[PDB]
Symmetry: C3
């Protein structure tokens, strides 16, 4: 997946960004089984005041998570995963849950590429990972934090 | 909804951003019935020259609106809403309509969270809001303009 | 289409951004027949360190291309197009392919506006273009490299 995380500039320190990315990545690995290194978290910072709710200019405490996933998972599991992102980002970013918005979009795995390779169907990551070259396996394995 | 609005740095002042956000938000409530406070407008600014059309580097006068919606509305209504966003953003941002691009993407409401809660289906916002806790209703209600 | 290209600040020079935009645009036109001027490439730069893979902070060498397309093309063609984007962006940016991520999303053409006009079905860009006003055609036509 790619989790695009929209936040205000200076809301999250480097350590807070790491914790938020860990929270999201752990949630995705834990509920889907997808290897850690296949989850990207991409922080998009803008100056505070660029977010409007109901036309009302917001401060720096809003977070929007746009998660981009492969088609193929149940609505039940997507709901658990969105809820766990809400709960765990709330803790990691020290932000009240009413400030957190999370949308998931899905596409066929056949039109998604990570590390220059087309993704497999959900749940077939082991088989796919074993038919990768040694060098590609090694590169992906460096992108794992517990 | 979340409307991601991609503009060049400095093309919209704070006042023009408020006007553009108000235009989009009024359009969305007016045509869908969704309460004002459920519409987010999220400005993403980049330096002039980061947009290319046909390979041609652009100035600061381009706008791309990526609207993210719940599934469930008609093509007719989505067309009227995209057109009204073109018309009203043209006036609010003082930009010619030919500079405006608008794409709508839809997801099941069941995978869409706002204010920490899952959204209802597109016509059920009234009863959904009523059955939120009082502190949640109060917090959403602070976001009306 | 709109190709949203997420890169680190300063990783691409203006020249490299032009090259990357031309690589993507030329790929899209060559494989789909869609005119040059209908393809937008929109660079979104953020400071290095804002990208995490598996929880590991990255340097400035990651690129994520989010292409937004009309519904109607085959999985075969979308696959060829994504592969050609990986290949041609790798050359244009001098970035190894392992750093390149590419996702395509699709929406109905009826909820898709470019140059203030609703798009036609894929393959029908010819008729559609011919029925635009002459001023609208002239404006579009300037966006060819």
């Amino acid at each position: 997946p790619v989790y695009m995380v929209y936040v205000s500039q200076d809301r999250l320190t480097p350590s807070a960004k790491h914790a938020v990315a860990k929270a999201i990545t752990d949630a995705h690995r834990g509920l889907t089984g997808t290897q850690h290194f296949l989850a990207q978290v991409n922080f998009q910072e803008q100056p505070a005041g660029n977010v409007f709710l109901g036309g009302v200019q917001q401060g720096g405490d809003t977070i929007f998570v746009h998660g981009l996933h492969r088609e193929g998972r149940s609505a039940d599991l997507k709901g658990q995963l969105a809820q766990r992102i809400v709960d765990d980002v709330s803790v990691a970013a020290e932000i009240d849950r009413k400030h957190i918005w999370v949308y998931f979009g899905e596409m066929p795995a056949q039109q998604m590429v990570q590390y220059g390779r087309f993704l497999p169907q959900p749940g077939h990551e082991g088989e796919w990972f074993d038919n990768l070259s040694s060098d590609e396996r090694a590169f992906m394995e460096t992108n794992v934090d517990v």
